[PDB]
Amino acid sequence: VDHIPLLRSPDPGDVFSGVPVVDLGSPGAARAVVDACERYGFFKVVNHGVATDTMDKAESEAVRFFSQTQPDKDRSGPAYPFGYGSKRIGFNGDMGWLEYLLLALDDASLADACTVPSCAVFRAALNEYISGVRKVAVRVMEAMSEGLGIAQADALSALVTAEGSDQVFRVNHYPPCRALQGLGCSVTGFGEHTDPQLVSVLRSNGTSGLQIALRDGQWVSVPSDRDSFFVNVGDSLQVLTNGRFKSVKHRVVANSLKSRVSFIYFGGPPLAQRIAPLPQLLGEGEQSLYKEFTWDEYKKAAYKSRLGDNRLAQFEKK
Amino acid sequence: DHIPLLRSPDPGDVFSGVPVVDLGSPGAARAVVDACERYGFFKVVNHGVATDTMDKAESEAVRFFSQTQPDKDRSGPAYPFGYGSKRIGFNGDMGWLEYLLLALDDASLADACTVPSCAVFRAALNEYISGVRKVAVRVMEAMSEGLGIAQADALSALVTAEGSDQVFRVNHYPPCRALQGLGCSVTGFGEHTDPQLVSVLRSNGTSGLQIALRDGQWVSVPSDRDSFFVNVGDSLQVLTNGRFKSVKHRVVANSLKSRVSFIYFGGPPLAQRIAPLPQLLGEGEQSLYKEFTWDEYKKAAYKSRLGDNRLAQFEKK
Amino acid sequence: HIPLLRSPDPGDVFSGVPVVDLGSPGAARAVVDACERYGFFKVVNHGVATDTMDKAESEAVRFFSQTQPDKDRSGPAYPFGYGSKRIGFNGDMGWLEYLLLALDDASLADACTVPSCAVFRAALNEYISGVRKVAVRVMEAMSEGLGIAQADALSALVTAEGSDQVFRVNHYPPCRALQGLGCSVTGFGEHTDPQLVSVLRSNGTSGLQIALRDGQWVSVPSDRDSFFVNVGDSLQVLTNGRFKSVKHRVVANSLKSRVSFIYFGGPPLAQRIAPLPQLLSLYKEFTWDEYKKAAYKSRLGDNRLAQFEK
Amino acid sequence: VDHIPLLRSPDPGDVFSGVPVVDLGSPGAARAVVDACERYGFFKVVNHGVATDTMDKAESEAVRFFSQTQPDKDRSGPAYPFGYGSKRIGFNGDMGWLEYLLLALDDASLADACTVPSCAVFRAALNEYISGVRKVAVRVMEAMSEGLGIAQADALSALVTAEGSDQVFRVNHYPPCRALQGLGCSVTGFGEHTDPQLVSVLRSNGTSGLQIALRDGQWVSVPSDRDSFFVNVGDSLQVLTNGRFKSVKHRVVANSLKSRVSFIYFGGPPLAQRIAPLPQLLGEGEQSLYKEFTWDEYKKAAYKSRLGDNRLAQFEK
Numbered sequence A: 001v002d003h004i005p006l007l008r009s010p011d012p013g014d015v016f017s018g019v020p021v022v023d024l025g026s027p028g029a030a031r032a033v034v035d036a037c038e039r040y041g042f043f044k045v046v047n048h049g050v051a052t053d054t055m056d057k058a059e060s061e062a063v064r065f066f067s068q069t070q071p072d073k074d075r076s077g078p079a080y081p082f083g084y085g086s087k088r089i090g091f092n093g094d095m096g097w098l099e100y101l102l103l104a105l106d107d108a109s110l111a112d113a114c115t116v117p118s119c120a121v122f123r124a125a126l127n128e129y130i131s132g133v134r135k136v137a138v139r140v141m142e143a144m145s146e147g148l149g150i151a152q153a154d155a156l157s158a159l160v161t162a163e164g165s166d167q168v169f170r171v172n173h174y175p176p177c178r179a180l181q182g183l184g185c186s187v188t189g190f191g192e193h194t195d196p197q198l199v200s201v202l203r204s205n206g207t208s209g210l211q212i213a214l215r216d217g218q219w220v221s222v223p224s225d226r227d228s229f230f231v232n233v234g235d236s237l238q239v240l241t242n243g244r245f246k247s248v249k250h251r252v253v254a255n256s257l258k259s260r261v262s263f264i265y266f267g268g269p270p271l272a273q274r275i276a277p278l279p280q281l282l283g284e285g286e287q288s289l290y291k292e293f294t295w296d297e298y299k300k301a302a303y304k305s306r307l308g309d310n311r312l313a314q315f316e317k318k
Numbered sequence B: 001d002h003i004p005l006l007r008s009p010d011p012g013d014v015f016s017g018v019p020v021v022d023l024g025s026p027g028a029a030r031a032v033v034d035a036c037e038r039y040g041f042f043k044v045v046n047h048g049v050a051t052d053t054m055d056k057a058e059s060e061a062v063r064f065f066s067q068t069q070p071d072k073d074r075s076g077p078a079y080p081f082g083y084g085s086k087r088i089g090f091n092g093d094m095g096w097l098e099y100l101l102l103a104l105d106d107a108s109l110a111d112a113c114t115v116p117s118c119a120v121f122r123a124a125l126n127e128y129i130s131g132v133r134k135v136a137v138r139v140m141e142a143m144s145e146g147l148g149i150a151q152a153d154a155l156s157a158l159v160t161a162e163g164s165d166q167v168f169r170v171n172h173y174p175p176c177r178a179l180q181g182l183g184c185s186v187t188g189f190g191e192h193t194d195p196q197l198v199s200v201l202r203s204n205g206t207s208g209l210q211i212a213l214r215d216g217q218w219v220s221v222p223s224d225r226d227s228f229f230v231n232v233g234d235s236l237q238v239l240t241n242g243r244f245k246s247v248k249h250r251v252v253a254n255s256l257k258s259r260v261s262f263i264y265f266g267g268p269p270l271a272q273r274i275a276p277l278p279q280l281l282g283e284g285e286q287s288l289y290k291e292f293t294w295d296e297y298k299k300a301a302y303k304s305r306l307g308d309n310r311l312a313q314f315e316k317k
Numbered sequence C: 001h002i003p004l005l006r007s008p009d010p011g012d013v014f015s016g017v018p019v020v021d022l023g024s025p026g027a028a029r030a031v032v033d034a035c036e037r038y039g040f041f042k043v044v045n046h047g048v049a050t051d052t053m054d055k056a057e058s059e060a061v062r063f064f065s066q067t068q069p070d071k072d073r074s075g076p077a078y079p080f081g082y083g084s085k086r087i088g089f090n091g092d093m094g095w096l097e098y099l100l101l102a103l104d105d106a107s108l109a110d111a112c113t114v115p116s117c118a119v120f121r122a123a124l125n126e127y128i129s130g131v132r133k134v135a136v137r138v139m140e141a142m143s144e145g146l147g148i149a150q151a152d153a154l155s156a157l158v159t160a161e162g163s164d165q166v167f168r169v170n171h172y173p174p175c176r177a178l179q180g181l182g183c184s185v186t187g188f189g190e191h192t193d194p195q196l197v198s199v200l201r202s203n204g205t206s207g208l209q210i211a212l213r214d215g216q217w218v219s220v221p222s223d224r225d226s227f228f229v230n231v232g233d234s235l236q237v238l239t240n241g242r243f244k245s246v247k248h249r250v251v252a253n254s255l256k257s258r259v260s261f262i263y264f265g266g267p268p269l270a271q272r273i274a275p276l277p278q279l280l281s282l283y284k285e286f287t288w289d290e291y292k293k294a295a296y297k298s299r300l301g302d303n304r305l306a307q308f309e310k
Numbered sequence D: 001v002d003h004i005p006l007l008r009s010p011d012p013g014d015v016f017s018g019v020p021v022v023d024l025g026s027p028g029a030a031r032a033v034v035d036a037c038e039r040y041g042f043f044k045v046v047n048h049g050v051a052t053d054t055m056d057k058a059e060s061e062a063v064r065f066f067s068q069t070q071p072d073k074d075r076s077g078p079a080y081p082f083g084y085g086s087k088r089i090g091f092n093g094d095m096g097w098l099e100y101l102l103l104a105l106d107d108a109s110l111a112d113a114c115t116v117p118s119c120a121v122f123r124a125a126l127n128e129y130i131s132g133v134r135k136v137a138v139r140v141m142e143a144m145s146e147g148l149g150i151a152q153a154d155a156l157s158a159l160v161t162a163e164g165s166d167q168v169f170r171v172n173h174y175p176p177c178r179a180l181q182g183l184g185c186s187v188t189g190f191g192e193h194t195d196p197q198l199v200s201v202l203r204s205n206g207t208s209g210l211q212i213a214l215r216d217g218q219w220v221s222v223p224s225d226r227d228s229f230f231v232n233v234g235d236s237l238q239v240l241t242n243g244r245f246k247s248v249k250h251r252v253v254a255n256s257l258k259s260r261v262s263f264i265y266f267g268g269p270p271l272a273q274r275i276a277p278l279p280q281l282l283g284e285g286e287q288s289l290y291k292e293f294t295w296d297e298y299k300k301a302a303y304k305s306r307l308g309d310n311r312l313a314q315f316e317k
């Protein structure tokens, strides 16, 4: 369904030093979160308390899995409802220079229904990491509701701690494209998009590749940092804040010399959840910018769409 | 990769013992229980769905499938809903078919299921759907009656509950001109049992449907565009601790005429625990099955190949 | 895709292929009768030793036994070499793999570097020498049977220097998908051969079929000890339509492996091709180079002889 | 291979400014030709006596043919032994971003057996151009011999004017690649190779694309010049000069914005011709670097190879 798109190779003039940095354990974190979410939809989290040991072991097990042979990996595929995938992203023809694991959580662990990966050592290293990253996600969302003045402390966080939360966990591997070294153009690792749910929390190895789109349309590279997290505002959080936090549009450009390995936690609510601006955030007679929908509805619409589509616009008011 | 071939079926394979259930008769409950215990399959006559409703749904489907392939492909692919061609599920199964896979709310097309977009086709489907869903409820009440369950809705409540996972599928098996008169036929839909509770099929007059009898022989079901054919699915085999056996069935494409099929699949809500109804568990009787939710069964189903024995991994030692 | 075919039913085995005993009087009359009535005949008592056929076969069996990666090194098949499934240039396909090889006189051309194995090349070359002698004797028998005093009137076209002779080794492996289904896969789709004659030998496996004049398709029983000879289009023209070229095809055997050797006797490229003077034209003037290049612009099943008819 | 390789988009620093230029109507031509053939294997030819008019009409008629629809073009397909081709180059998987005509020549014009193209106007325009460029090839080969100090003035030119010489004529079309505008990388129009014959003579429209490898391996861009010819030493001329003239390795980098149309005459000898150093160029005792072979052998070994292969190596001692 067409090939992987090419992109102009990123400059070093494209690097972005202004990514906001949030010390979760700290005073003024709640305000730094709000500010970053308002102007970028994206920020780095440090001193998050997830051990570098568990991050390193999750990565090592992932690298081991992806180093298997293509037929051995294909036994865990395809990626839907869960499992291993190669190049194809979603259902509608998108492709990237990547391979990945798309996995399902129950609360703070892999779901037992999600039988990939089968190797107990990989599964156990993933589960320790997932526990850690899920607590960071909850803390980020409490810092959100706090910096937004929400008395209810779990106003956001409770949507992913609820029973039957739709929480997704994805391991991406962008191998090197050696065919393109020095040629001025680079292959898309993961085409541009916004994430559909509340928040995503990413951790990578040290290889570059992640880019975000600024408000003025410009694409900038985010320097990688294997010991910190990067947090995305997703479309659903754009709606719960009535447009105050805009979803960050982001993509991955594959490196032509080093493998890039990423772990991403996606916080989504239960399927039945009605997604609308939090009553607490609407002023007197303020109108929602959005039609009413449920998460199940948004998610299904999402899977009928292309990666780069503006999925929110179909649910915006006219 | 490629669509399997099969021995063309000849009149020697026709099966005359398909149980008949007269849905308006008070003997339906006993016929249904008997058929579910012997074949997992039965025809349903005198069902109250008008032939004009069936005709107009079929006519609108045929028109959709007559569209060019680029035009159909715009309603594709088939997941989470929509149009599909040849590929069945996610794991390489293929058949000489195209189809629509549609989602329901209660007894109509779900608003979120945007396919088909054409309001005439949608209206005809919604009329047919309303009728067949009523047939399925009646069938399931007859089953519970014939099983001796006090609660009349012991089964039917599972597809009428809020958040029911009910699927509606339109299958088109077109002619295969190339195989005309060659002694072999292309697979229309590979062999499988259905995962949920009950399936209710109606087709146009074309042959193709086959079922496997308990001894494994494949026999052809005579088509009847005016009746329904009901399948026991894996989840109902579990609710009856093995009493009702899921029917294995397939479609062999006809090399001469289109076969157009409508199928309603009755599933429960995703969170339903699937286990032997406690009413059907004698004294000390042990369930043959591990406990599981419909969500779990369905997720494991989509990880499997069409012909896999999906129940096997949920059976006890 | 590879076209499927109705499986051949024993009903259509043809027992009446003419038999030409090459060491018997009246070989000449039998040869000519079969070239007129069928375009096709069996050749027995031909002098090629059983031993030289079996060694050609087993070395070819050995070659096809290699891995697909190793066989692909000798491919694809043009201007010579190994091919798989694709026949010609215009999308024809069959369930087969093969070697198409070029001959210098009665041997594999040194320029034809496939196959590389010396053992295999030896067996082929000894086989090729035998069958080419059989081809010459067969063409000499046709001139005798036509009342032509020059007994090399046909033979000379393939003994000339620069004669264009091709040799192919076909392998039709089993098709397990189809066993006992009543439909068989095409091993090699219907065609007439463009040259003067072709001389075929196979192992015992069924699969060769010819079209009778009608033309119903009938199965020819295999016979590993004998050759089967086709009239090709060029020989139809050299006889102004008296021998019509046989239309033939191969239907792969779903259980069995069929291995074939075919020599194709063509003239030199410069050869002007017309009814032999001794036998007098329905055909336009053309050279073998012309017919060959036009043949390669066509599909297997095309009537290549029409665009050269009046 | 199945992908068309990409290459760095050529910058202005890659522009070769010193392509050798040969005034064909000049007495110094012969010295300039030998120097260029030894040092670059490539030179430009000006003041060549082919009318701008002749070139324009062949070009417009080729543009007309290529603007035909794909189904209509494909009926002159495929390209072997003669005809139309798209993307695929030769037999062994090479691909470029182009379509083309591969045509056979007889004497000074299109061979009648090469039925493509059908349109007598195209054919007529092509034959006028072909007559012009073949005479340029003959004059070039005459200047080569004069400059080697060979007495017999047709010692090279006679191999292509001879009866049954294997001359080939190719019309290449490199359409734009809009998908890559501004991305810094370009798509391969025609992969690197040397030509197997004696000489090749090329003329294009004004769109860039042609690049050659210098002796030190650097790839440089050749400025396009729609009114001049560019001449390549081929592998066979390397053998007839005993290694003195080295065949130029070259390629085309498709322009992403504009269409590039090319004609190329390939001067080869008759198939039976023994290819070896010209007697005159071996001083007593001097050893030929090459096994003995015939054009037919070299040409067939060439078609068994891949485009970038060093075809000359297997025929070295």
Ligand SMILES: C=C1C[C@]23C[C@H]1CC[C@H]2[C@@]12CC[C@H](O)[C@@](C)(C(=O)O1)[C@H]2[C@@H]3C(=O)O
Binding pocket: A089, A090, A091, A092, A094, A168, A170, A193, A194, A195, A196, A197, A266, A302, A303, A305, A306, A307
């Ligand atoms: C075409 C796609 C691919 C989607 C769904 C749809 C649009 C949005 C994409 C993502 C983007 C974010 C998450 O990785 C994901 C798992 C998610 O939730 O949305 C993606 C999902 C997928 O890759 O399968």
Ligand SMILES: C=C1C[C@]23C[C@H]1CC[C@H]2[C@@]12CC[C@H](O)[C@@](C)(C(=O)O1)[C@H]2[C@@H]3C(=O)O
Binding pocket: A080, A081, A299, A300, A303, B079, B080, B081, B298, B299, B302
């Ligand atoms: C068992 C399931 C669950 C499916 C459908 C079927 C197989 C594929 C699954 C997904 C996976 C991707 C999307 O979330 C989804 C909405 C989709 O489109 O496909 C899923 C859908 C569901 O969870 O309801």
Ligand SMILES: C=C1C[C@]23C[C@H]1CC[C@H]2[C@@]12CC[C@H](O)[C@@](C)(C(=O)O1)[C@H]2[C@@H]3C(=O)O
Binding pocket: B088, B089, B090, B091, B093, B167, B169, B192, B193, B194, B195, B196, B265, B301, B302, B304, B305, B306
């Ligand atoms: C390989 C497949 C194809 C499945 C899923 C999985 C196993 C069972 C199949 C069916 C069988 C019955 C229904 O048609 C269906 C919609 C259903 O519910 O189960 C099918 C579903 C699909 O086509 O998407």
Ligand SMILES: C=C1C[C@]23C[C@H]1CC[C@H]2[C@@]12CC[C@H](O)[C@@](C)(C(=O)O1)[C@H]2[C@@H]3C(=O)O
Binding pocket: C087, C088, C089, C090, C092, C100, C166, C168, C191, C192, C193, C194, C195, C264, C295, C296, C298, C299, C300
């Ligand atoms: C479509 C094809 C395939 C041709 C060329 C063209 C038409 C005639 C075919 C044969 C038919 C007979 C010989 O096998 C053959 C080697 C031959 O000489 O002619 C074939 C050749 C080829 O396979 O390369």
Ligand SMILES: C=C1C[C@]23C[C@H]1CC[C@H]2[C@@]12CC[C@H](O)[C@@](C)(C(=O)O1)[C@H]2[C@@H]3C(=O)O
Binding pocket: C078, C079, C292, C293, C296, D080, D081, D082, D299, D300, D303
């Ligand atoms: C080096 C050669 C020799 C070719 C062209 C090119 C590659 C393919 C060869 C053939 C092979 C098949 C036909 O005989 C032919 C006439 C044809 O069409 O292709 C051949 C042609 C030739 O011998 O003149």
Ligand SMILES: C=C1C[C@]23C[C@H]1CC[C@H]2[C@@]12CC[C@H](O)[C@@](C)(C(=O)O1)[C@H]2[C@@H]3C(=O)O
Binding pocket: D089, D090, D091, D092, D094, D168, D170, D193, D194, D195, D196, D197, D266, D302, D303, D305, D306, D307
């Ligand atoms: C891979 C290829 C493509 C070849 C044959 C083989 C090796 C050399 C190539 C050229 C290169 C020069 C001419 O364009 C050509 C027509 C020629 O004479 O040789 C090419 C030929 C072809 O395209 O058919």
Ligand SMILES: O=C(O)CCC(=O)C(=O)O
Binding pocket: A170, A172, A190, A195, A202, A204, A210, A250, A251, A252, A262, A263, A264
């Ligand atoms: O893998 C990465 O580094 C980011 C990819 C991404 O944004 C996603 O998978 O939604």
Ligand SMILES: O=C(O)CCC(=O)C(=O)O
Binding pocket: B169, B171, B189, B194, B201, B203, B209, B249, B250, B251, B261, B262, B263
């Ligand atoms: O389409 C038909 O006729 C029956 C196919 C079937 O049984 C199914 O899709 O589950």
Ligand SMILES: O=C(O)CCC(=O)C(=O)O
Binding pocket: C168, C170, C188, C200, C201, C202, C207, C208, C248, C249, C250, C258, C259, C260, C261, C262
């Ligand atoms: O004997 C065989 O199987 C091949 C006969 C044939 O049809 C051919 O390839 O020309």
Ligand SMILES: O=C(O)CCC(=O)C(=O)O
Binding pocket: D170, D172, D190, D195, D202, D204, D209, D210, D250, D251, D252, D261, D262, D264
């Ligand atoms: O087509 C061009 O412009 C040059 C390509 C070339 O040299 C060739 O096709 O051999």
